[PDB]
């Protein structure tokens, strides 16, 4: 099967499988896993931050960041189509007792003036705005790159008000590859960044949160509370090091395959916009087709293509390491045949 559902389905490379077998391990509860310790040291250095914390998931990364940044009844400004709001189970409410303050954005880019206006005045009736979250790349909009200038402007606003800044940088390396902006440079405008090892960088498990020592110390106690305090997790960290240090550059190939796929899908007759394709995601609309997104997902699966429907009329196609250029070509031959059928 050709799996275009998500970059989450990436499997470990042979180099990672080997590194996991030979991993040097220890009890991370005591700070004694040498591989964890090295991955964290590396993550911290790559983002120009004092400290780093490995977590079993990006959700946990964001949720411990929120905890470490907030007090009960605080408010978090985030983009209205962001993952923290949509896809993290209302955890910020339950775990941290904080309210989201959604601001609309153009492809993840909140207008700095709208962020300015979402910030609470000091008044008894109002929660305290203590955190602003920015997502790069932006997922719901189709893997779009927030301009560095937006992040720089929003950062400045936050300094003026003493408000912390988090980048949900689940796909920050995809952002860096597309934009040319080094991740240290995005990171410098943030108090904390969460990034995933387990999507396009192909590690089997986990993400990392980078930040200041005192922030990470708090986040590490948050992690213990939430159940992220693992033992000999250096098995996972071994894959994690290879993800971080060796698997970034080739993300360029995911973007090329995605753009190649979109252009060719448009030639066939599918309703796609290749000019919208900036990273590893292609949005496919089904309005011109005889079945909706859900029916077309089934027709694709029967022909050996996996994809998800994100609404009744939209499918998302996501490239990653485990879909090669050949697989893209194979998929296109299938998409051609299914156009003769469902157009």
Pick left, alpha or beta for residue 73 (phi over 0 → left; psi -120 to 50 → alpha; otherwise beta): left
Give the CA-trace dihedral at 100, 189, 244, 225, to 10 degrees. -40
| Nearer to a copy of itself among residue 40 and residue 189 (C-beta) | 40
Q: Any bridge partners for residue 281, and if so which?
A: 318
CB of 169 to Cl ion, least distance (A): 15
Q: Any contact of residue 157 with a copy of itself (CB under 8 A)?
A: no
Sites for Na ion among residues 281-320 (CB under 5 A): 286, 289
Beta bridge partners of 105: 110
State the DSSP code for 250. T
Q: Cα separation of 138 and 34, whole Å?
A: 34
Distance of CA 275 to CAs 158, 222, 260, 264, Å? Answer: 33, 41, 11, 13
Residue 338 makes contact with Na ion by CB under 5 A: no
| Shortest Cβ 11–Ca ion spacing (Å) | 6
**Beta carbon nearer to a copy of itself, 38 or 256:** 38
Distance (Å) of CA 316 to CA 63, 73, 146, 223: 26, 36, 20, 32
Q: Is 12 in the site for a copy of itself (CB under 8 A)?
A: yes
32 binds Ca ion (CB under 5 A): no
Size of the residue set binding Na ion (CB under 5 A): 2
Size of the site for a copy of itself (CB under 8 A): 74
Asked if residues 168 and 134 have their Cβ atoms less than 8 Å apart, the reply is: yes
Partner interacting with residue 289 (select from Cl ion, Na ion, a copy of itself, none; CB below 5-8 Å by kind): Na ion
Contact status: 67 vs a copy of itself (CB under 8 A): yes
The counts of H helices and E strands in the chain are: 14, 14
Q: Among 94, 106, 182, 252, which residue sits at the site for a copy of itself (rule: CB under 8 A)?
A: 94
Using CB under 8 A as the binding rule, whether residue 321 contacts a copy of itself is answered as no
Stated as kind and residue range, the H or E segment containing 169 is: none
**What part of residues 318-337 is at the interface with Ca ion (CB under 5 A)?**
322
| Closer of 23 and 265 to a copy of itself (Cβ) | 23
Among 37, 38, 97, 256, the residue binding a copy of itself under the rule CB under 8 A is 97
- Residues in region 129-168 near Na ion by CB under 5 A: none
The residue ranges that bind Cl ion (CB under 5 A) are 24-25, 71-72, 124, 144-145, 221, 278
């Amino acid at each position: 099967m050709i799996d275009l559902r998500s970059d989450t389905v990436t499997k470990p490379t042979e180099e990672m499988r080997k590194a996991m077998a030979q991993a040097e391990v220890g009890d991370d509860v005591y700070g004694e896993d040498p591989t964890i310790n090295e991955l964290e040291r590396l993550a911290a250095e790559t983002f120009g931050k004092e400290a780093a914390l490995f977590v079993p998931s990006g959700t946990m990364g964001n949720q411990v960041s929120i905890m470490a940044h907030t007090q009960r009844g605080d408010e978090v400004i985030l983009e209205a189509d962001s993952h923290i709001f949509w896809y993290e189970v209302g955890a910020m409410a339950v775990l941290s007792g904080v309210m989201p303050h959604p601001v609309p954005g153009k492809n993840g880019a909140m207008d700095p003036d709208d962020v300015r206006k979402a910030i609470r005045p000091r008044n008894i009736h109002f929660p305290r705005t203590s955190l602003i979250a920015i997502e790069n790349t932006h997922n719901r909009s189709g893997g779009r790159v927030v301009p560095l200038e937006n992040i720089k402007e929003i950062c400045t606003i936050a300094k003026e008000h003493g408000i912390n800044v988090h980048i949900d940088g689940a796909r920050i390396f995809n952002a860096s590859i597309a934009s040319g902006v080094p991740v240290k440079e995005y990171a410098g405008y943030a108090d904390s960044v969460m990034f995933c090892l387990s999507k396009g960088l192909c590690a089997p498990v986990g993400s990392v949160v980078v930040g200041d020592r005192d922030f990470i110390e708090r986040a590490r106690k948050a992690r213990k509370m939430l159940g992220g305090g693992m033992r000999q997790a250096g098995v996972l960290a071994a894959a994690g090091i290879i993800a971080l240090t060796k698997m970034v550059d080739r993300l360029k190939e995911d973007h090329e395959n995605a753009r190649f796929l979109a252009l060719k899908l448009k030639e066939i007759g599918y309703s796609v916009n290749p000019e919208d394709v900036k990273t590893n995601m292609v949005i496919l609309r089904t309005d011109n087709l005889k079945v909706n997104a859900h029916g077309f997902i089934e027709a694709l699966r029967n022909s050996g293509v996996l994809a998800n429907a994100v609404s009744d009329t939209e499918i998302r196609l996501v490239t990653h390491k485990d879909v090669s250029r050949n697989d893209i070509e194979e998929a296109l031959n299938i998409f051609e045949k299914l156009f003769r059928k469902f157009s």
